[model samples]
Target: AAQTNAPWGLARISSTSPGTSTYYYDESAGQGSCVYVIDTGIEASHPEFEGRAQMVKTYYYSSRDGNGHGTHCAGTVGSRTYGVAKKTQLFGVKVLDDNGSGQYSTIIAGMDFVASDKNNRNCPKGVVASLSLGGGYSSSVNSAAARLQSSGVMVAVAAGNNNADARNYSPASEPSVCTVGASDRYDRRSSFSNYGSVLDIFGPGTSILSTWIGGSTRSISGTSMATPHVAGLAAYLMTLGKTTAASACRYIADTANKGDLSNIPFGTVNLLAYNNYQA
Candidate 1:
């Protein structure tokens, strides 16, 4: 259960573009943790994954990444170069189609598949479900995420990119989800990110770079990108023996670095997502 650390550049800011994340090195960085990117899909063959990613479910389209969104999000969650948990057992559960869109029912179906083991695959020691997509509110979708969480999966979701209140969104409004919003390099709320008391934390999202489809990398932004940073850190926390979903959330929330974003209605929580972890 050991592997070499990713290059220091993987965490340090070599340039002044997307900003830098503090590097955390652990021989067991997500070594046995199972992280599911519940979105478009992942180019599982991407070299950065080192053969760690697998496609587990596809509700509305082929189990291949057509749009680069899901792959990019997956990379942030577990890829060796752009991730928090470098060696996590990564799984892609595609709820959205090629257009980066999907129905509420489709998303729930994918969540259902993730929560089951009908495929005969061994149940993972732990699970982290990272959802980087959201639109209007949907009770059914939130209910499905709640069910998954009740079954012992740590769930992280984007708080929407609308720059408005997150209470109007689906999983973001879902209390069981770790609702992540976007922040820029200076730790200020991204101009496009939604905010409010409902938000659980903020993460780097402005001009963020990560793995793209077709075995590539690209820079993009949104609460979508921020979601995976929190997701990855949560997954890394799960790798510690006997950590519960609630405890993991508490640990993250308690250890989060303080932020100084004032003037936003409802205000920002002190919980800024810190990528580096030690335990």
Candidate 2:
């Protein structure tokens, strides 16, 4: 269920592992802004998302296009008013299959797809790419993310959900990329958030309630949830004249809740104050 007052929700993905994540929304994200999300395929007809989210692609490597991971991630990023960037357009690239597994090559292909679509007539000239899934840190993958950054695509990635200090592969670990960590109600790093000073920023990722597959709803948790908080906020910041990824990230960190600033766990951070400042 949603927290109502807070920008967070919950999702039940499995019997033993119900997840929690964020549902932050900022009005300045260009409402109908387009973004390419690299993950599993999304359920375009989700209840909280029906008539709210538009689909551009649902391509997967091996599995059919019924996977819920990407759908859940999309909901977290921009499901509806209940989502972080509810008004934003979503493009689903299924790097992982229905089983929620994939090779680094597939992930790379997804990034390439985002770049190709951006350069061509996909959606807009330049749209921020939101990535919620990540393994450990990898130099090769980080290099790929750097290429995306050089190409002017704002890349957002999870700082990994392993609760370690290390960064994640591809997007998060890449320099100048917008890497996000997870936080809880009190703004403390959740029990399962990876902490690194290099991690760009953070947002609510505890107990997020969102749409599941097959006409269902549930709660979920992870830095995966936190990444999109930054994504939506980025759209807002971009609207505020914060163009570069670094400036956008700085706006988030700078506008973080001052009350939680001193005691903010290790990596988890909040975006409420930041949104209030510019918007």
Candidate 3:
């Protein structure tokens, strides 16, 4: 059945920049129960965001906001109209403070918080963490995210911004983690997005628009943006009832808008045989 004159207008944002017809969602869709955004404390006061976004809690491993980088990253994922999972819940884990850096030990502490918070008596079942920060592959101690995945939480991390092979690090390089790479407005891999055989797939992260502090909308570029895009997408698919990490990842990889994937570099993450769960 269809309403002849629905009050809400229908429109879809392009998946990649440069303006195309691809969109991850539309107005007809209802909000999902919840989705976790693991980034800086979202500016819940910004007009564009206001009541639209909610912050679960923030963990400050670093003491300051050096250059507002975390804020910028959070804006892309939970700011407002610019987010794929706008109605989702965001959790801020300030592992890197103003210096945008923190020791591996502190990062592990943050991971512990995400995994189990019996003391806090806060948050929900678990969250679909949208981690957009990473470096080259390393046996860093912050690999606690993998265990969280096995327990049923969906983990999405950046595939690195270096635009090279998947030398993904800690949270991202973890076996069960969904490492996301960046793509242009046309859904082609971004020039600056890191690539590797381990990357899961591509998402919209180049020149992304989102909520900015002081009531402004700004654009950003990186696998950071793409990571949230996938995070939100995972949340949306979960709305369709896919609960397990492997189930969610499978749906996304299979349903991914692969129209522009031909231009991507060789050895990049492939969506075709990505069923890690043997499904």
Candidate 4:
């Protein structure tokens, strides 16, 4: 069920959970935009989703969220009570299975589905892809992301949780994807977050609360969690007429809360995120 208050992260970004935030814009729920969570799967029947979720494609056998990670990520992107873009249509592109792992071939197929316009089911403007998975670099995944970018789908990928250079990971390392790192609520880089020049943005990812499977909610930490904060914000930006990937990406980076990170990189922090709307 929807809540009476906003999630901490959404509140910071000027979004209220379901019935709160009377001052919010009419399009704050991501009205016409679509955010595709390319992960395990989403809990389509969760009350928090308010019927906006669709399990669009399943690269693996099933589209059920047995692992719960994908459902949590989807909620952060847009579950009526916990979402950043509460109204953005949510879709699950199941690449990862219950064990939380999938092959590069499967991931690429998932991306292809999002990029295709077959059956005229594609979102006319574009799709904002949220991928909360990472692993060793894969050229195929990079190529797939690049194709999606060219087709106008913006991808947000997690910098690995290994605390090393994000440049070593695929999809995250892909030039077109927005590579996100985790930051605590106190504005400190998460201990498990990967850093380096490949990082495009930092977002609230530590002890982050969001929707879960079975009509529940929980908190988890990782760069994966951080990825959806950026992705959801991207979807919100699209609803505001920043429809193109390049434009939304620029707005996010340009308006970020620079130097917000306590663990500054290269003597300063860059593109640490903040999504306060223009009032």
Candidate 5:
């Protein structure tokens, strides 16, 4: 199903021109790939999930979300109407609680749980984990995230919204993880998005509309939002056999639109994330 009247972030990835109005993707682009949303948790009954989303792990009592961040990020990753991967399975890995706060130990535990999933092989393409939550530097979390990637789960993490060098944040600073920054529809870096040599790529993050709590949708902006867009694209690329994080990251960087983004920091890669359909 082709997407008409799509959200700006979705449309931005399919074409280099910010003027493109439609978000087009192969119906099966993300078929069989799995994404473990390691945030608060997903509203399992959210209409956009279309019964394809479920919770497989939780640090909280239930895989339910009161804080809408998880649901919104989940939508951007695989919702039927507002996502890049139309057919990917979403697995909620709850590390953050309802208020979207969690310790590094719990976060690392979440990553390890995702890594231990033997069912990740159920999909022809391997699994990907969208870690859109981050904070100050934690070497433990960074090592765990790298271990998650080494386990063959493609990890896409936030570069933080601090507007400072992403190299100063954990998971984002972890050299092995694919740290993603945020860009706006105008192909410029988001004012709040962290940059520097650490950001692996940029994704549309401003005024992005996606699923929310209470069976609704809303628009919000953050580097958290941008990470999953890249995660969804990674889920698609994994189907084409770039199953590991390193391989998927290489392809993402190789095919990203270079010199297309504006206001990037001196050492940062000025590449905007592009769905393989176009670039």
Candidate 6:
């Protein structure tokens, strides 16, 4: 028997072999960490969450997750069945609206909440936040991201799906955060994934299936879909003692499947995010 029950994205991260279809992992590995998913909102009641996801703060229209993007992102981060860090605490910080759009002030306000949060204030693995939303270059947004980082919360940002240099985006270009791009099953950068100096690593995005707002699951694609995989990975790495963003990024890079991905553009960080996992 094989453990291929894992979503291919999850199975892919645990094995370097191209055809390795099974998922090998330490199910409780991310127990000591907390992940703040900054997005539209998460369907906290989705069964996949197993009661681990909660909507702590909302800067948008209401408490409900009308948009499924955040829920999907968090699913990849800490959902019981589809997540990367199964036991990591999951928090939904709603910044974007149901339309999948948010203003700078709205986003920064959510960021402020995560920076000042007191719960799990000193988790041994450290706290992490995932940014699946991004806008055009905004100096203020970048500064706000830096402020969050200064609070010791590691931030993982999507590199954006603009198909252009990631440096043209706000938080994605912020060097303090880990900017994750998308990689397809062939280990090549996806056509829609942004590239540039700001990218920290790559993770699977296309055909990713995860929790949704209707208390169900769906497959979607985007760099937005790829970020939380690394956010989950970073959550686990922090538990292994890489508490800071820089340290976790370093360890992940070193542990990544290098020279394996194809179609990566010039000057982009070529590391394919990997996890410490096995039978």
> Which tens-of-lDDT digit does each residue in 1-279 have in candidate 2?
232343333221101111334222244443545566677777767777656454555445433346676767777766654465555676767787777777888787777777777665343323677888877667767777767666767788888877776454446677677887776655567778776666777666777666677867677888877777667666545654555544666666675544442344444443322354311
Q: Report the lDDT tens digits of candidate 4 across residue range 234-255.
A: 8877777654676666678777
The TM-score between candidate 4 and the true structure equals 0.90
**What lDDT does each candidate get?**
0.76, 0.62, 0.56, 0.78, 0.88, 0.85
lDDT of 3 by residue, 1-279 (tens): 122221111011222223433334533121443444555445556665546555445456432333455556655554445555445555566666555565666666666666674234332323466776665456654356676566566778887777666654556667677888776655467788777767777776667766555556677788877777667666555654554455666567765545455456776654421111211
Q: Flag clash pairs in model 4.
A: 29-87
RMSD of each: 3.8, 6.0, 5.9, 3.6, 1.5, 1.8
- TM-score per prediction, in order, is 0.88, 0.80, 0.78, 0.90, 0.96, 0.95
Which portions of model 4 miss their true places by more than 4 Å?
Answer: 1-5, 15-27, 117-119, 122-125, 267-269
- The window of 10 residues in a row where model 6 has the poorest summed lDDT is 117-126
Q: Top TM-score: which candidate number?
A: 5
Q: After superposition, how far is residue 72 of candidate 5 from its true place, in Å?
A: 0.4
lDDT of 1 at 40: 90
**Candidate 6: residue 129 Cα off by (Å):** 0.4
Clash number for candidate 3: 12
* lDDT of predicted model 3: 0.56
lDDT assessment of candidate 4: 0.78
Q: Enumerate clash totals for all models, in the order shown.
A: 0, 21, 12, 1, 0, 0
Give the per-residue lDDT digits (tens) of candidate 5, residues 1-279. Answer: 458789999888888678677897766769878888999999979989999899888877787898999999999999998888978999998899998999999999999988887354476677889999998998999999999999888899999999899878999999888999999988889999999898889999999999999999999999999999999999987776654556888789888888988898788998888875742
Arranged by TM-score, best first: 5, 6, 4, 1, 2, 3
The local lDDT score (0 to 100) that residue 264 gets in candidate 1 is: 50
Q: Candidate 5 at 37: error in angstroms?
A: 0.3
